[PDB]
Write a protein that binds this ligand. Sequence first.
Ligand SMILES: [Fe+3]
Length: 316
Amino acid sequence: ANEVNVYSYRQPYLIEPMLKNFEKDTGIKVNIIFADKGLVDRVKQEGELSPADVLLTVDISRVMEIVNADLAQKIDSKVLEKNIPAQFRDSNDQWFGLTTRARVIYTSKDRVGKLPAGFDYLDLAKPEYKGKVCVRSGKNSYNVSLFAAMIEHYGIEKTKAFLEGLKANLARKPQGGDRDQVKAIKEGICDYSIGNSYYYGKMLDDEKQKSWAEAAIINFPSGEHGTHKNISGVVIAKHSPNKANAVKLIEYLSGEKAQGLYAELNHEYPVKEGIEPSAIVKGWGTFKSDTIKLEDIAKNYEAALKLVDEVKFDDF
Ligand SMILES: [Fe+3]
């Protein structure tokens, strides 16, 4: 066959455009399965008979789970070397970042306005925000990786206290995704949410959700450690049965065209130097990105997940 088998943690609407362009431009057929969980364990249990070629991630911690479990292989590509800056790929060539995203704080336009300079994630645990914060499941990987970064910066005790305070301030039982929290802001249920940056652009582009975005302000935390960054990523599976095609896919996704699609269609930040963000994303302005090393986020993921369970974050 002339195919590549993709296991995707990315949502269809945020990856199918790139994959369809890849199919058209290369002639390689994409077979894709989607999930929110269980794909790493699936590759592991499938073992040497796994058909997986490419694992698409939305989180550095998932990437490292795959790589640490010896489920990846090293890819030595001059195309990836050129297209992906070194800070967004494994020094040992087993994973590759394709975009970055910020986990931001959305606020009610009407009831909060823009956050002041210096506002940090930690501030969301302060008693003045009781009943005013919406967050999706604390066990969602975007949240766990944020909390993992917080462990690196503040330690486990202060991060646990933060999670207790954040939980205490929730306006409702964690439910829905990042966009749904912004709907809740629009409807007046909460005044603050945590969510990824690109969703704001997706909502603005959606006729049914632009009113949600219009009721909210995107804020990039500007405390000591700035705004949390994470990546969409990719690994080629250890036993990739269509490895040449897999390499062609990840090389394609790293290229000028696909990076432009990530920027323009997804409102993510491309990794490739020289590729501009969308007009919407540019309009948000710049911000201070956390300088934490991507691997040091992942290092703390399991501890962060344990904290989320300990504080029973999702139990209202
Ligand atoms: Fe996402």
